[PDB]
Design a protein around this ligand. Structure first.
Ligand SMILES: CCCCCCCC/C=C\CCCCCCCC(=O)O[C@@H](COC(=O)CCCCCCCCCCCCCCC)COP(=O)([O-])OCC[N+](C)(C)C
Ligand SMILES: O=c1[nH]c2cc(C(F)(F)F)c(N3CCOCC3)cc2n(CP(=O)(O)O)c1=O
Ligand SMILES: Oc1nc2ccc(-c3c(Cl)cccc3OC(F)(F)F)cc2[nH]1
Ligand SMILES: CCCCCCCCCCCC
Ligand SMILES: CCCCCCCCCC
Ligand SMILES: CCCCCCCC
Lengths: 138, 51, 164, 50, 141
């Protein structure tokens, strides 16, 4: 089986989110929306921290930009501390894995064997017109 | 060789995992976060039942 | 109320930090040898029971400081001084500064302790797997107890200075 | 046929649950916690003098 | 075997405690209402304000649950949670006043009692189902 040697493709848009898997991005989104609502509920059991302002605080804390206000209660502070730890680890992971992507590059053959080539069918594969390598498949 | 293989041909087709961080690498921080929210909601009720 | 708690904390912390250094069950490593701060002892081998000391020969400063384990010794001294200062506050009362002195001694104890363990763990590694015993965790518990009694001593001092 | 290599099959090697802590040894994390407590207490003490 | 659906079930597990506490407060507030000059009024406006401000989070959070399940592809559970969302969309609720209540100390009180008890039962059952689903998805690893 003869295929063209795989070279690096043109980097598509929305490539900036390659260093983290899709599942991690979805979990990040819903973790942010869960932390904000929990911080709201906590600050409204016992400080403003309404939903609109709690979402801003959580988003500010994730993007490493300084927070406007800080929780004063205890239960409002546990949430802040946990979300700070989480965002620190996630940003460090993203930066490190992106550095790995840029440093050493791995190229994988799109197709490995003929069984997978039949399964794919996205790549068109052709023989010579008439001959043993052609009459064999018939 | 194949049609009677004891180990079988499970995942016989080539499977090349991507180089992106999977959720299995950083699952610990998600466990910690969900536990932290659970604890915060325990404390935020103990305070209110206190008053 | 709180002076008694500070006293019990002071002497419990001193007891734990004088049991940590004297006894030898700090580090478990390989036959299995339950090590110590001064003496290494053997277990499950040709020899057992009786045991021998450590040999410790500008990395020389690390070697000598780890050898002459000064920082835990000084932590024990400071905890004892804080204990006697809190004791002497009850008599000769209304000194208003002996309790603050105790609050500083019980914190310098924590600082000297944490230097002691940083030095010990730094010198220890000078592959094989190791583990930590109960002398190590008495040291670690003494640190926590020292910091807490320090904050309680400052709290008492502030309350007694606002009462005047 | 021919003479062919034979090697042990590489396992999946699933990561640990708390694998994100590897880039720093156990001693570093625990001394971070202990230095945090120490710094908090010292900052409190120094802040309060009457 | 940590998975997106597992994490969504865990997060729902955390939030369902708050979702229960809301309905418990609703039950207590109804019981305070039923057992009855201007002081009684001020009491009834206080309770009405409590209920009006407490209604919305109880609906928005359940909206989060159904949205998370839709976006995480768990249909056996989204099917369970759809009927309660539809009831929470004021399907049976008429258009008389913005708040739930005019003292309305009538059969409306009994109806709100019954639906609040039913909602609490549903919430606790769904809580245990979420706990089971989370344990099943994680421990199966
Ligand atoms: C003016 C307004 C927006 C800019 C419009 C861009 C038009 C010019 C770019 C054309 C282009 O290259 O298309 C590309 C981008 O096409 C997009 O759709 C870009 C997405 C940005 C829209 C708003 C983002 C969210 C809003 C704010 C959120 C808060 C093709 O993108 P695609 O169709 O998604 O295919 C995926 C490409 N891939 C194969 C590399 C992954
Ligand atoms: O006996 C045969 N020996 C053959 C040997 C070769 C090669 F080895 F490559 F030289 C080739 N080619 C295949 C493509 O590369 C160039 C020519 C064809 C052969 N054919 C014709 P087939 O029947 O179509 O295989 C024969 O009959
Ligand atoms: O005198 C002593 N000071 C100490 C300070 C800390 C510890 C300790 C504990 Cl308590 C648990 C786990 C690891 C520990 O050591 C660390 F440095 F943190 F790795 C032990 C100590 N003993
Ligand atoms: C080999 C010399 C032994 C020295 C041990 C004396 C220290 C014990 C604790 C002292 C604290 C007051
Ligand atoms: C090895 C587990 C201990 C790690 C503790 C991480 C917390 C550090 C933030 C203060
Ligand atoms: C006021 C007593 C202090 C309790 C926690 C202190 C931890 C350093």
């Amino acid at each position: 089986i003869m295929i063209k040697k795989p070279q690096k493709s043109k980097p598509g848009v929305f490539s900036f989110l390659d260093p983290l898997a899709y599942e991690i991005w979805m979990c990040i989104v819903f973790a942010y929306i869960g932390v904000s609502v929990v911080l709201f509920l906590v600050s409204r059991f016992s400080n403003e921290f309404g939903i609109f302002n709690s979402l801003w605080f959580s988003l500010g804390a994730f993007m490493r930009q300084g927070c406007d206000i800080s929780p004063r209660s205890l239960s409002g502070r546990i949430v802040g501390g946990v979300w700070w730890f989480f965002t620190l680890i996630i940003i460090s992971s993203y930066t490190a894995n992106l550095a790995a992507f840029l440093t050493v590059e791995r190229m994988v053959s799109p197709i490995e064997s003929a069984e997978d080539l039949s399964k794919q069918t996205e790549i068109a594969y052709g023989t010579l017109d008439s001959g043993s390598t052609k009459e064999f498949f018939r | 060789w194949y049609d009677k293989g004891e180990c079988g041909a499970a995942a016989a087709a080539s499977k090349d995992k991507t180089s992106a961080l999977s959720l299995s690498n950083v699952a610990g921080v998600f466990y910690i976060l969900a536990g932290g929210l659970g604890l915060a909601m325990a404390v935020a009720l103990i305070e209110f039942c206190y008053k | 109320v709180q002076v008694l708690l500070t006293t019990i904390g002071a002497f419990s912390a001193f007891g734990l930090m004088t049991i940590a250094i004297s006894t030898d069950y700090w580090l478990y490593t390989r036959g299995l040898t339950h090590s110590g701060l001064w003496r290494i002892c053997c277990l499950e081998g040709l020899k057992r029971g009786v045991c021998v000391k450590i040999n410790h020969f500008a990395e020389y400063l690390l070697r000598v400081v780890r050898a002459s384990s000064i920082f835990p010794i000084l932590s024990a001294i400071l905890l004892l001084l804080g204990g006697v200062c809190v004791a002497a506050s009850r008599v000769y009362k209304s000194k208003r500064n002996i309790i603050l002195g105790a609050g500083i001694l019980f914190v310098a104890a924590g600082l000297s302790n944490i230097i002691g363990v940083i030095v010990y763990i730094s010198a220890n590694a000078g592959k094989n797997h190791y583990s930590y015993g109960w002398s190590f965790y008495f040291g670690g518990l003494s640190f926590i107890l020292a910091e807490v009694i320090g904050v309680l001593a400052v709290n008492i001092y502030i309350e007694r200075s606002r009462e005047a | 046929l021919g003479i062919s290599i034979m090697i042990k099959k590489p396992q999946k090697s699933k990561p640990g649950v708390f694998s994100f802590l590897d880039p720093l040894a156990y001693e570093i994390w625990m001394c971070i916690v202990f230095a945090y407590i120490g710094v908090s207490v010292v900052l409190f003490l120094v802040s309060r003098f009457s | 075997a940590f998975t997106f659906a597992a994490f969504c079930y865990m997060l729902t597990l955390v939030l369902c405690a708050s979702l229960i506490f809301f309905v418990i407060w609703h039950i207590i507030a109804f019981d305070e209402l039923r057992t009855d000059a201007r002081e009684r009024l001020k009491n009834i406006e206080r309770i009405c304000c409590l209920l009006r401000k407490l209604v919305v989070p109880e609906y928005s959070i359940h909206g989060l649950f159904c949205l998370m399940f839709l976006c995480a592809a768990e249909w056996v559970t989204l099917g369970l949670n759809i009927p309660l969302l539809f009831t929470h969309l004021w399907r049976y609720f008429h258009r008389p006043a913005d708040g739930s209540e005019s003292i309305m100390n009538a059969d409306i009180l009994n109806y709100c009692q019954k639906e609040s008890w039913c909602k609490l039962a549903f919430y606790l059952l769904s809580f245990f189902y979420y706990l089971y689903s989370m344990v099943y998805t994680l421990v199966s690893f």
